[PDB]
Amino acid sequence: PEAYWNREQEKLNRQYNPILSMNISHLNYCEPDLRVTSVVTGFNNLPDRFKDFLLYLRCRNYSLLIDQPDKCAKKPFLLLAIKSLTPHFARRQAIRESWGQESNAGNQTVVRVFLLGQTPPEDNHPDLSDMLKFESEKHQDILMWNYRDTFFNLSLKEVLFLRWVSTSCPDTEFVFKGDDDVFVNTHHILNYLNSLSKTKAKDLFIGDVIHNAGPHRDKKLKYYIPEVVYSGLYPPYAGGGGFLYSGHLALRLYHITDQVHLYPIDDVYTGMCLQKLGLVPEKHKGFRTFDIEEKNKNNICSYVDLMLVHSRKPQEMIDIWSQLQSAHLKC
Ligand SMILES: *[C@@H]1O[C@H](CO)[C@@H](O[C@@H]2O[C@H](CO)[C@@H](O[C@@H]3O[C@H](CO[C@H]4O[C@H](CO)[C@@H](O)[C@H](O)[C@@H]4O)[C@@H](O)[C@H](O[C@H]4O[C@H](CO)[C@@H](O)[C@H](O)[C@@H]4O)[C@@H]3O)[C@H](O)[C@H]2NC(C)=O)[C@H](O)[C@H]1NC(C)=O
Ligand SMILES: CC(=O)N[C@H]1[C@@H](OP(=O)(O)OP(=O)(O)OC[C@H]2O[C@@H](n3ccc(=O)[nH]c3=O)[C@H](O)[C@@H]2O)O[C@H](CO)[C@@H](O)[C@@H]1O
Ligand SMILES: *[C@@H]1O[C@H](CO)[C@@H](O)[C@H](O)[C@H]1NC(C)=O
Ligand SMILES: [Cl-]
Ligand SMILES: [Mg+2]
Ligand SMILES: [Mg+2]
């Protein structure tokens, strides 16, 4: 293949599969990979996010600057992992007070971590480090790694989080991973998990699954991908707004990430890893990555049988959660 990602991924396959038989690491090489500037046609005219992505593609051994090593001291039933950016204090606090509160009903432990990278001064971010330290010491739910938190590094956020699950939470029965702008019906998720056989729970992966998609080639769009970078269709994948999977599958996914090069779209990368495990993510009608109908937004009963809705402001999560607590008396 002439697209760079497909070509490098093909070399990874030959390295991990002897059946294809007939030098720098791809995991901890953290100097700029200068070979790309001549191998990728038109490299110097690509947007800077693609330049950074290609140059540092082969580095993924980043360290935890803020950890919660005992977050899973009690074996969790459901681990909530929410991707967030440093300045999103209102979003995280609204999630703590509403659908992301830690609980222990029925001795089914629900624990919560927020997943952050760094917002460094070199990239003109305001210094909010003291506020973040304050928030971490009070709420103890912040995991932070030492890489530039950007959209094109979100698949790195996924791999580093899966590494944390494998080292610090390998016994969690289920994992929900989602965004910090979605409302999640945590009560409905728990009822769904308790209705699953152990056979079905073992390789659980459900979400708003997209089939037969491909890279957008419109340079003006958010998910634009040049043809010199990737070619062909995307594997099936759940919309990143939120998906639900078992801890057992989380450990298998982490192991397989070594065999898949990082990709600028994080939920596509998780689909590539599922495909390499021989699994297909399962569409579930309760995942509304594109919101619900206008008139239904006002009726709390529209939320009783949903898993999540995208998107919702901090104030809206709290209002929906509060009304939802008495929805069994009204719907
Ligand atoms: C995902 O997250 C990772 C981890 O944070 C990011 O990786 C970092 O990327 C930055 C670039 O954004 C890297 O910083 C750059 O390093 C270049 C190479 O530095 C080496 O080589 C020079 C020259 O030999 C040495 O001087 C240097 O000490 C290193 O040995 C620098 O050349 C860059 O300089 C830039 O900034 C200066 C101003 O400070 C300008 O004047 C320059 O012209 C130039 O623009 C820059 O410092 C950094 O090394 C990466 N870190 C790691 C750990 O890999 C990814 O970028 C990020 N990916 C995405 C897509 O966001
Ligand atoms: C509903 C839905 O399908 N959302 C997906 C969409 O994001 P979307 O288009 O919804 O854009 P958002 O601003 O909501 O960001 C998505 C999520 O990633 C977090 N975030 C964003 C930027 C960043 O640098 N670091 C960070 O952690 C946000 O806090 C947020 O939780 O495309 C992203 C990939 O590009 C996916 O990861 C998102 O799951
Ligand atoms: C990753 O490991 C390599 C090899 O030991 C090392 O040179 C590099 O500095 C590491 N990267 C980070 C971000 O620690
Ligand atoms: Cl916010
Ligand atoms: Mg650059
Ligand atoms: Mg969003």
Author numbering: 55 to 76, 89 to 397
Question: What does the study report here?
Answer:
In the B3GNT2_UDPGlcNAc structure, the donor substrate UDP-GlcNAc is positioned at the bottom of the cleft with the GlcNAc moiety close to the center of the cleft. The side chains of Asp215 and Lys223 are hydrogen bonded to the uracil ring of the UDP moiety, whereas the side chain of Asp246 is hydrogen bonded to the ribose hydroxyls. The pyrophosphate group of UDP clamps the divalent Mg ion in a bidentate manner. Two pyrophosphate oxygen atoms, Asp247 from the signature DXD motif (Asp245-Asp246-Asp247 in B3GNT2), a conserved His376, and two water molecules, coordinate the Mg ion with the tetragonal bipyramidal geometry. These interactions force the GlcNAc moiety to bend toward the cleft wall, almost perpendicular to the pyrophosphate and parallel to the uracil ring, and fully expose the C1 atom for the nucleophilic attack. And superposition of the B3GNT2_UDPGlcNAc and B3GNT2_LacNAc structures shows that the acceptor substrate LacNAc binds right above the donor substrate UDP-GlcNAc in the substrate-binding cleft. The hydroxyl group on C3 of the Gal in the acceptor substrate points to the C1 of the GlcNAc in the donor substrate at a distance of 3.7 Å. The Asp333, which is 2.7 Å from the hydroxyl group on C3 of Gal in the acceptor substrate LacNAc, serves as the active site base and abstracts the proton from this hydroxyl group. This facilitates the nucleophilic attack on the exposed C1 of the GlcNAc in the donor substrate UDP-GlcNAc, which undergoes an oxocarbenium ion–like transition state.
β1,3-N-acetylglucosaminyltransferases (B3GNTs) are Golgi-resident glycosyltransferases involved in the biosynthesis of poly-N-acetyl-lactosamine chains. They catalyze the addition of the N-acetylglucosamine to the N-acetyl-lactosamine repeat as a key step of the chain elongation process. Among the characterized B3GNTs, B3GNT2 is the major poly-N-acetyl-lactosamine synthase, and deletion of its coding gene dramatically reduced the cell surface poly-N-acetyl-lactosamine and led to hypersensitive and hyperresponsive immunocytes. The luminal domain of B3GNT2 comprises an N-terminal helical domain (Pro55–Cys125) and a C-terminal catalytic domain (Cys138–Cys397) as well as an extended linker (Arg126–Lys137) that connects the helical domain to the catalytic domain.
